[PDB]
Write a protein that binds this ligand. Structure first.
Ligand SMILES: CCCCCCCCCC[C@H](OC(C)=O)[C@H]1CCCC(=O)O1
Ligand SMILES: [Mg+2]
Ligand SMILES: [Mg+2]
Ligand SMILES: [Mg+2]
Length: 124
């Protein structure tokens, strides 16, 4: 369960692709750096700005359907090949997000993934 953090994982090319999305979403949502890093490397915690940040990243990454809900196939296909099997196992019992709004369902997904596989979960 200890987070995996080394030269290959999270993939540096994915981190570099996420950085401009982070910059957009951090300013739109106001989330704190401490909130992101705790959720990534530490414990699940509940923060409304963080939930909105998670929804915003899915929108900025273009992995949402016409209603703004995550399209898990588009998401899976956007990850590096090195992460295809890790992501599949992390997400196979997280198919159907619950929540009344898009921030809540984004948070639901991130909690579900982090509980399923805390070693490979990360957030930036
Ligand atoms: C049939 C199975 C469908 C699988 C659907 C895709 C699952 C994606 C799993 C979550 C992604 O994490 C990993 C390790 O792939 C996210 C975490 C936010 C940071 C990130 O880059 O990716
Ligand atoms: Mg570049
Ligand atoms: Mg920042
Ligand atoms: Mg800690």
């Amino acid at each position: 369960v200890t987070p995996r953090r080394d030269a290959e994982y999270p993939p540096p090319e994915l981190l570099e692709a996420l950085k401009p999305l982070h910059d957009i979403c951090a300013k739109k949502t106001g989330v704190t750096d401490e909130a992101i890093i705790e959720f990534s490397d530490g414990k699940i915690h509940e923060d409304e700005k963080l939930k909105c940040y998670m929804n915003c990243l899915f929108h900025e990454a273009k992995v949402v359907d016409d209603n703004g809900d995550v399209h898990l196939e588009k998401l899976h296909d956007s990850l590096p090949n090195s992460m295809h099997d890790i992501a599949m196992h992390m997400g196979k019992r997280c198919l159907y997000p619950e929540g009344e709004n898009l921030c809540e369902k984004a948070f639901w997904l991130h909690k579900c993934w982090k509980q399923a596989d805390p070693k490979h979960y990360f957030l930036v």
